DNA sequence: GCCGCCCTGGAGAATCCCGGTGCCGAGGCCGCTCAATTGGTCGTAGACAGCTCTAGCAACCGCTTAAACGCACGTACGCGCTGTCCCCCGCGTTTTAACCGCCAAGGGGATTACTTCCTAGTCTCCAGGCACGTGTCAGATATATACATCC
């Protein structure tokens, strides 16, 4: 998921832009990739429950 | 008639038992004597109470994921048997030194008593080192943007 679909130019090595859109997550994978999601600029945070 | 040989009885000496007396191990008694006891005083160690903050605990949840577990196979190793040879054990003989009993004098060291003085405990006062918290600063890291170039 992290290198097929985040990025649209993931063989680039300067700034990547976003694919995506949505990005539905769980807490488990949340305390588990905090470093690979921290950076990147979001627009809006949901959480549910 | 005279001389030599076999059988049997009572008195002299050795041994067991008992009593009187002297010597070794241990306990009661006495004397010194120093350390335990008793009595009193006082300071403080610790018990108790109180408040604050953090860790642990019982019993439950949910998720992930790597470790544990079960099973099949295979093969390496523990174990048993046999041979062999060699080295340790048993014994007889000879040596030798440990052991015990001796000088011969001298120093080391354990006590007993005494003297002295240096140094460490104790007390008071003070200050700086250690513990904790924080502002700031230079090295490391990541990316923004401009230039040369291949297809």
Redesign the pocket.
Known sequence: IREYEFYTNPRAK??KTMKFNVLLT?Y?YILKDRAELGSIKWQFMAVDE
Do not use: A, C, F, Y
Request: avoid cysteine; proline fraction near 0%; charge should be neutral.
């Open positions: 300067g700034k769980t488990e």
